[PDB]
């Protein structure tokens, strides 16, 4: 009821044994009443590592998108080693979403690595179960066995109706996903552990399908973008391997489903100044001259009768002399061109002082030999060239034309394919102009270039006019155990890709949310634009180039920091060599670096002085020692992970305050949220995701099931908790309900339609479904629905949530009125009460933990010791936690060696892995998540609690209690002890 206190553990240890004499009764009672639950005490185990690989094929759908819906690919298995290193080999194949699917090596939620199907963003199959939301559901297939060698899996995806189907060895899989969120792009993915060998088959050039695709399903290889070539790559990574060594890599840039749609500017309604009959005709004539010259250069000629094989121009007259349609074609050509120019900031004109007469119009080498020759060339480029802004303007004109073209192509119903197929309405060039290759970019620009030069010669006066913030930065720092408070130290940073990198010395208490140098916690240098940041910005030094090494030295004797670029010391504007001076030592300094989107770098601390470059040039004889030189093992580094998680609200938070009021008359214990700086300057308003620190767990079996009636109170199972919205706070900006442990969405524009949801349906052989289970991670109701029923109303809004742990359903009421919204869940599920609110008043919300007639309070559900106590109470363990976007994580010392290489045009792309890699995981029972045990090196409270837990284990096992030792052997096994014996970190 109070929390994790080591003093209680010490009390139990003193209970066990005193003065060298063991009390067997106390030891047995403690072992019986503490160990079997496997809750409230941290757990330890050994797990394997899981890595995922994708084929770099992104497919999705949107309104007016240029992509295709149905897709299908093949995966074959060559070698599988069952039970490698005491654990079953992991191998799953499926689809993953671009946004939200960012697995990391180690840690994770659910007693091990996630892989495919352990989150609501990925869907997978492993030969016996369907995996989604970290939940496995058995499925019936003619061949029911785990993924074996020489087994082939066919994976298809339909976007018109959300449904992912699998087919093993031709035999269909009776289970299918449905009704999943369509935001983002889907890509194939395979997750695996050490000891596997698989091969992707996308058809066409790369691989051959073992079984024919279902009708209407296109091969995956047809979805490759023209700008890129096929290549196997991991999903996401914060490091890579190179000849220099481990290259730290920043966040990557990914496309979106809305990027493929064309969004041009309509110009048909645009009116034009009186320039049509004045200069539009002249522009048309110039276009005719250039186009006829192009024909004359080739074998095309002008015969009286139009013919293609005979090379005969239809008009066959020097002057175009076209009839109404043919002439109006070029008339509308130039009209649309002028309309596009006027739609943008460019303003057309003809102020040239009769420069048309001054034009040459005589470049006739007599190469023409027929009627439609003598096409004058104005030599407009020779007179005046095109400015860079003019060339850019040509570029956006071509882009606008291509975009409107793609718009009609989508309107008729065309789609994109890597292979051209006219009967199939598939065109490999209808992607947006940015996504087009340079060949078609040049092909759709020459005529516009000529027209724009004509405009220049004619005197045209046209003149050209939160959540993502965390995802665009990545910080790597040395571990807090390597802080230096004396001496002179040096390290190096190589910038492989120039731009958006910031290297320097930070402090142990540096936060991951804030940028480097924004706060006083870091002294950093930015070489992309050549400045130094301690608190603010100030120019210093020169920008770097690709392959440049910057050496950072710090001396705490002189309290200075010096940055050198390629062996030369950078100096400020005044000429001072030291970038910073008069720096208090404080608690020490650590090496730190920050990388932006699509950036790579090499952080060389200098374990081996031979590999350290430019050290002898500057630093060796100046008395500086390389950082981390004499240590035997490489430095463990911690990186800034952008996975949102719920953390307790700090008591010193400047903006939000939590009050704990209880025991009042006619009011149950409650927790009230208040805004400290509302209605004042320097106040920030944003979405706030709050939850309770303790969950309520449903029963294993769903076997049905004035003053309060005691018999019903003892026989009831329902529970109640309410949320009060104070007057002045808009009910339209509150969502009240429950959240599963796996909720990691920090959307600033949260809506009830943005929640995850997926229905898994099991069918029979004939296709008659018999089970359809819905899975999500957020069960809430919106206050907008209640207020709409009916300015600021003095009456508060009370929303009460009722749950039934036996039946398995939850209902919602507002102001004592039953609401139509209800939810149903599955057994063995734990939900935390939660509210998502946008503050708009000084008083925001109040969690009330009370009770109703014949309904029991949440305290009994949360705490076992008070299961039969109807009196509401708020023990100190119950607390309000808020979502936090960014956190710190520990980089693993070793990583899997995944080898990817195309086997052949008929074999596909082969992926293999054989080197085992295991880790020790510490699991929190209530939160249902685990982290690496080495992460306790910085978590000094969990470390102390676990040490006292081990002491308690020794105490209960002390003095020849062999039965208790046998019982303990199940909790801590031989393998864990042997692994921990040789654990050097």
């Amino acid at each position, epitope marked *: 009821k109070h929390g994790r206190n080591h003093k209680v553990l010490d009390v139990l240890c003193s209970l066990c044994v005193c003065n060298g004499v063991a009390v067997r009764s106390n030891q047995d009672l403690i072992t019986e009443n503490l160990l079997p639950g496997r809750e409230l005490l941290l757990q330890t185990n050994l797990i394997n590592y899981v890595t995922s690989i994708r084929p770099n094929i992104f497919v999705g759908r949107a309104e007016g998108s240029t992509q295709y819906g149905k897709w299908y690919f093949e995966v074959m298995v060559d070698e599988v080693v069952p039970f490698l290193t005491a654990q079953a080999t992991h191998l799953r194949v499926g689809w993953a979403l671009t946004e939200g699917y960012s697995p990391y090596p180690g840690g994770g939620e659910g007693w091990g690595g996630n892989g495919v199907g352990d989150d609501l963003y990925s869907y997978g199959f492993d030969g016996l179960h369907l995996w989604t939301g970290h939940v496995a559901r058995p499925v019936t297939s003619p061949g029911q066995h785990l993924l074996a060698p020489e087994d082939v899996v066919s994976c298809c995806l339909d976007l018109s109706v959300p449904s992912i189907s699998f087919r093993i060895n031709g035999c269909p899989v009776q289970g299918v996903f449905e009704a999943f969120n369509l935001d983002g792009l889907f890509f194939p993915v395979v997750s695996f552990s050490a000891g596997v060998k698989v091969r992707f088959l996308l058809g066409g050039r790369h691989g051959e399908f073992k079984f024919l695709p279902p009708p209407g399903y296109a091969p995956c290889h047809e979805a490759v973008l023209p700008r890129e070539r096929l290549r196997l790559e991991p999903i996401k990574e914060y490091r890579r391997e190179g000849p220099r060594g481990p290259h730290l890599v920043g966040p990557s840039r990914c496309l979106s489903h809305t990027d493929f749609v064309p969004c041009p500017v309509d110009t048909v309604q645009i009116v034009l100044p009186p320039h049509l009959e004045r200069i539009r005709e002249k522009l048309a004539e110039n276009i005719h001259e250039l186009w006829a010259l192009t024909r004359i250069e080739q074998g095309w000629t002008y015969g009286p009768v139009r013919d293609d094989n005979k090379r005969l121009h*239809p008009c066959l007259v020097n002057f175009h002399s076209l009839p*109404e*349609p*043919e002439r109006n074609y070029n008339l509308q*050509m130039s009209g649309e061109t002028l309309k596009t120019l006027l739609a943008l900031g460019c303003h057309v004109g003809m102020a040239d002082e009769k420069a048309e007469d001054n034009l040459k119009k005589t470049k006739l080498p007599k190469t023409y030999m027929m009627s439609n020759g003598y096409k004058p060339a104005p030599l407009d480029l020779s007179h005046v060239r095109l400015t860079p802004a003019q060339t850019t303007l040509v570029d956006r004109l071509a882009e606008n*034309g291509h975009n409107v073209w793609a718009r*009609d192509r989508v309107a008729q119903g065309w789609s994109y394919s890597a292979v051209q197929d006219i009967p199939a309405r598939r065109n490999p060039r209808l992607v947006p102009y940015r996504l087009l290759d340079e060949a078609t970019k040049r*092909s*759709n620009r020459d*005529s516009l270039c000529q027209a724009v030069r004509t405009l220049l010669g004619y005197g045209y006066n046209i003149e050209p006019p939160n959540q993502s913030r965390w995802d665009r930065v990545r910080i790597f720092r040395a571990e807090k155990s390597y802080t230096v408070q004396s001496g002179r130290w040096y390290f190096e940073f190589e910038a492989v890709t120039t731009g958006e990198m910031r290297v320097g010395w930070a402090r142990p208490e540096l936060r991951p949310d804030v940028e480097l140098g924004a706060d006083e916690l870091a002294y950093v240098f930015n070489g992309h634009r050549g400045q130094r940041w301690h608190l603010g910005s100030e120019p210093f030094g020169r920008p770097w180039q690709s392959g440049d090494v910057v050496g950072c030295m710090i001396d705490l004797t002189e309290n200075t920091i010096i940055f050198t670029l390629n062996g030369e010391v950078l100096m400020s504007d005044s000429g001072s060599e030291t970038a910073f001076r008069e720096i208090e030592i404080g608690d020490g300094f650590l090496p730190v670096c920050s990388l932006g989107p699509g950036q790579v770098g090499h952080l060389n601390l200098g374990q081996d002085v031979s590999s350290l470059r430019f050290f002898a040039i500057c630093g060796l004889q100046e008395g500086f020692e390389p950082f981390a030189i004499n240590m035997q093992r490489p430095v463990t580094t911690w990186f800034s992970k952008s996975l949102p998680q719920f953390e307790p609200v700090p008591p010193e938070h400047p903006h939000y305050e939590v009050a704990r009021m209880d025991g009042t008359v006619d009011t149950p214990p409650c927790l009230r949220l208040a805004h400290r700086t509302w209605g004042s300057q320097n106040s920030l308003v944003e979405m706030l995701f709050l939850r309770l620190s303790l969950p309520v767990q449903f029963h294993q079996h769903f076997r049905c099931t004035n003053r309060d009636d005691p018999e019903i109170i003892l026989n009831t199972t329902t529970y109640y908790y309410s949320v009060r919205v104070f007057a002045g706070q808009e009910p339209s900006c509150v969502w009240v309900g429950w959240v599963t442990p796996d909720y990691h969405q920090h959307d600033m524009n949260f809506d009830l339609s943005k929640v995850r949801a997926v229905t898994v349906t099991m069918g029979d052989e004939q296709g008659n479904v018999h089970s359809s289970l819905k899975c999500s991670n957020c069960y809430m109701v919106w206050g907008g629905d209640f207020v709409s029923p009916g300015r600021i109303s003095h009456t508060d809004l009370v929303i009460g949530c009722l749950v039934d742990l036996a039946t398995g359903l939850m209902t919602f009421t507002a102001n004592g009125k039953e609401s139509n919204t209800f939810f149903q869940v599955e057994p063995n599920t734990k939900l935390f009460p939660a509210v998502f609110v946008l503050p708009t008043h000084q008083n925001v919300i109040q969690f009330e933990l009370g009770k109703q007639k014949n309904i029991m309070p949440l305290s009994a559900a949360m705490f076992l010791s008070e299961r039969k106590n109807p009196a509401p109470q708020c023990p100190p363990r119950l607390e309000v936690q808020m979502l936090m976007p960014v956190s710190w994580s520990r980089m693993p010392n070793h990583f899997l060696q995944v080898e990817t290489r195309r086997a052949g045009e008929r074999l596909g792309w082969a992926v293999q892995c054989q080197d085992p890699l295991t880790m020790m995981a510490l699991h929190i029972p209530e939160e249902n998540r685990c982290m690496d045990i080495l992460e306790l090196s910085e978590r000094l409270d969990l470390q102390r609690f676990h040490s006292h837990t081990l002491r308690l284990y020794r105490a209960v096992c002390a003095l020849g209690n062999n039965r208790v030792a046998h019982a303990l052997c199940s909790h801590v096994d031989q393998a864990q002890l042997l692994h921990a014996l040789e654990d050097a970190h």
Partner: nanobody, 126 residues
């Protein structure tokens, strides 16, 4: 959107007369060059005589026989007549409208690929 509904060209013996009606329903702008294509079963797609606004007709190899193609811009109606027949003439005919006039286009690929196909109909010769 410009939709070209093409109906006619029923099964007839050699020498029979076939009438095909093509109607292009859509925006009146860029209505021109209501050309014709034909794809033989499992063979290449050839170009039938293309008629454009202004009474301009362009012939090719596939126009062999008695081909009379006439178009009306008032209602965007093309009345193709094939008085003779040959066994090789069996193909799926399509009526296609393209903004490109008389097969000439000084604009470039963006307007060359600006094309509006049609459903078409199957013409069979015994």
């Amino acid at each position: 959107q410009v939709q070209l509904q093409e109906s006619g060209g029923g099964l007839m013996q050699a020498g029979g007369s076939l009438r095909l009606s093509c109607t292009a329903s859509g925006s009146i702008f860029s209505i021109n060059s209501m050309g014709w294509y034909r794809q033989a079963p499992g063979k290449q797609r050839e170009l039938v005589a293309t008629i454009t606004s202004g009474n301009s007709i362009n012939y090719a190899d596939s126009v062999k026989g008695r081909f009379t193609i006439s178009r009306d811009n008032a209602k965007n109606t093309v009345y193709l007549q094939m008085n003779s027949l040959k066994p090789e003439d069996t193909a799926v005919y399509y009526c296609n409208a393209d903004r490109v006039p008389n097969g000439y286009n000084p604009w470039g690929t963006p307007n060359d690929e600006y094309d509006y196909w049609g459903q078409g109909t199957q013409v069979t010769v015994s």
